[PDB]
Amino acid sequence: DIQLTQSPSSLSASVGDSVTITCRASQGFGNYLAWYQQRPGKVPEVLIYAATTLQSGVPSRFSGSGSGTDFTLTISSLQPEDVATYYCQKYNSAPFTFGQGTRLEIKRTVAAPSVFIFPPSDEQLKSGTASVVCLLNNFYPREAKVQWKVDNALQSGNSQESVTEQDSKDSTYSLSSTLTLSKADYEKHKVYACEVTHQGLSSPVTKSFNRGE
Amino acid sequence: QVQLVQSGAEVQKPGASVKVSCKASGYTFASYDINWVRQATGQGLEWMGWMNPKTGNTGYAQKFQGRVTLTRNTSISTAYMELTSLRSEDTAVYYCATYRIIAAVGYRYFQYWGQGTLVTVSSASTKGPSVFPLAPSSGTAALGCLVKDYFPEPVTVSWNSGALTSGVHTFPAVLQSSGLYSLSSVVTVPSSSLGTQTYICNVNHKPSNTKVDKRVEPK
Ligand SMILES: *[C@@H]1O[C@H](CO)[C@@H](O)[C@H](O)[C@H]1NC(C)=O
């Protein structure tokens, strides 16, 4: 009984812009439909209930409309902290089905990454492993590329990247690239460098350090 | 005010079962259903079931019946969720939730949520992290903590006991080919502070009852 279909699954808009999320039901359920926000690393939080009622304490830019089988969540003036997954839910009776969820991203102005490189700690070398880290800080858009060089030999198969969620204040990304080597390999070679390509950079930016100094 | 507090993150092997607890406070526990919701790795919220604490009556989503037992202890205001025949696909954050506290019918939207409980399905043993410093080089300076070789997720990193937050980036954990997690936490600060300001990162890994503090000095 009653399937819930949420669209779009993904969305991208600017600050102060108006966006709309859609919840279609396969059948009427008396408008007992709630809207939840789930922000990165947070528990869900209700925005709207009874199709169109704004929960107390929820910002005014949130509004629900619709009835029968067609429902809408509107954000009339998008803010950075609205980066989240949005969910529709029926609560007329069991089952309390959730929608598939709609992920919202902030489109902002292009920004180049600030690049920092971190040698392995003396401490770590005793484990037999060396972790070289490359931080790409505060960039947009999300697409970036990191290439490791050890004495100018490009590296492959021995590194991992991790991206932060879009910052809820400046809408930028950060990325970490870890190069993992044996202690023998790390003390074999001298010059450790990461080369960053991003659409806000005219040419690749390299950061390097010399082992020892 | 109303609060739901759940048990800590947990690891259980394939086919092993797990029991999660949800202690309630700030209202009459027996007069309202406890609902259970889950978020699998790369999935949306999934309603699992409901339980009445007065009667012990239960109802489950088709995907979950014959897999879930909802119980309670009314004397300590606790609800429990038992899940059997654990598979790779059952790795998820599990939430308990309750309705808004009101007399009237038709307010069974989930106003209140437990903090959540990460449940990890794997035969890998538990391990506390090693924390290594990411020392500032050579203005704006970047420094951080490498939290390496822990299992399962999650860890919490804070800076100067929550004192420092503006400029903090904690990366999502990445599972290495070793079968253990690693993440980094970094922070951009004024250069002129490395001489006077103390920068400590606090790493809590609760599945191993591990608490490490690393001082980050310029090398
Ligand atoms: C409820 O919990 C307490 C332990 O905190 C225990 O003494 C008691 O036997 C339990 N009773 C029921 C009915 O679960």
Numbering used by the authors:
A (entry chain L): 1 to 213
B (entry chain H): 1 to 52, 52A, 53 to 82, 82A, 82B, 82C, 83 to 100, 100A, ...
Could you share sentences copied from the article?
We next determined the crystal structure of the antigen binding fragment (Fab) of the highest-ranking RV305 ADCC MAb, DH677.3, alone and in complex with clade AE gp12093TH057 coree plus the CD4-mimetic M48-U1. Conversely, RV305 boosting substantially increased ADCC breadth and potency (DH677.3 ADCC score, 4.56). However, when infected cells were separated into p24+ CD4+ and p24+ CD4−, it was found that the RV305-boosted DH677.3 MAb mediated ADCC against 4 out of 7 HIV-1 IMCs, whereas DH677.4 and A32 MAb mediated ADCC against two or none of these IMCs, respectively. Although DH677.3 percent specific killing against these IMCs was low (mean, 6%; range, 0 to 24%), the level was significantly higher (P = 0.03 by Wilcoxon rank sum test) for mediating ADCC against p24+ CD4−-infected cells than that of A32. That DH677.3 was better than A32 at mediating ADCC against HIV-1 clade B and C CD4 downmodulated cells makes this MAb an attractive candidate for targeting HIV-1-infected cells in vivo in the setting of HIV-1 infection.
CD4-inducible (CD4i) epitopes within HIV-1 envelope (Env) constant regions 1 and 2 (C1C2) are targets for antibodies that mediate antibody-dependent cellular cytotoxicity (ADCC). The C1C2-specific DH677 memory B cell clonal lineage next was used to study affinity maturation and ontogeny of AIDSVAX B/E-induced ADCC responses. Rather, RV305 trial boosting of this particular RV144 vaccine recipient profoundly enhanced DH677 lineage ADCC breadth and potency.
